[PDB]
Amino acid sequence: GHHHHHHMQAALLRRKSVNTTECVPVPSSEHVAEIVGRQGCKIKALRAKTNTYIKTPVRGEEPIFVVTGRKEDVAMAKREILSAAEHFSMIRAS
RNA sequence: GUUUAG
Hints:
Layout: H1 2-14, E1 20-25, H2 29-36, H3 41-50, E2 53-55, E3 64-69, H4 71-92
Antiparallel strand pairs: 1-3, 2-3
Helix pairs in contact: 2-4
The protein binds one RNA strand through helix 2 and helix 3.
Subcellular location: Cytoplasm; Nucleus
Subunit structure: Interacts with USP7, which antagonizes the ability to degrade mRNA.
Protein name: RNA-binding E3 ubiquitin-protein ligase MEX3C
């Protein structure tokens, strides 16, 4: 709800425990789809696991996630997104 | 043996 959004922005403004925001590109919206999962189940699990705010890109726009949180947490979420994107490329590529 | 949540 709005409480979560407001508190998230307040945490960014303190720049204590949340201190990093990074763009994480993947090759295509099809990659985005498989990384996010149905109903966003996989990207929501990733946010929970890494304690990160993640913005999923809209289909048809640039397939680039934005990941925000503690530096080491953003690095873990970025690692998992990029590894997932490479996974789907390796197993789907013709 | 995966295919877009707020």
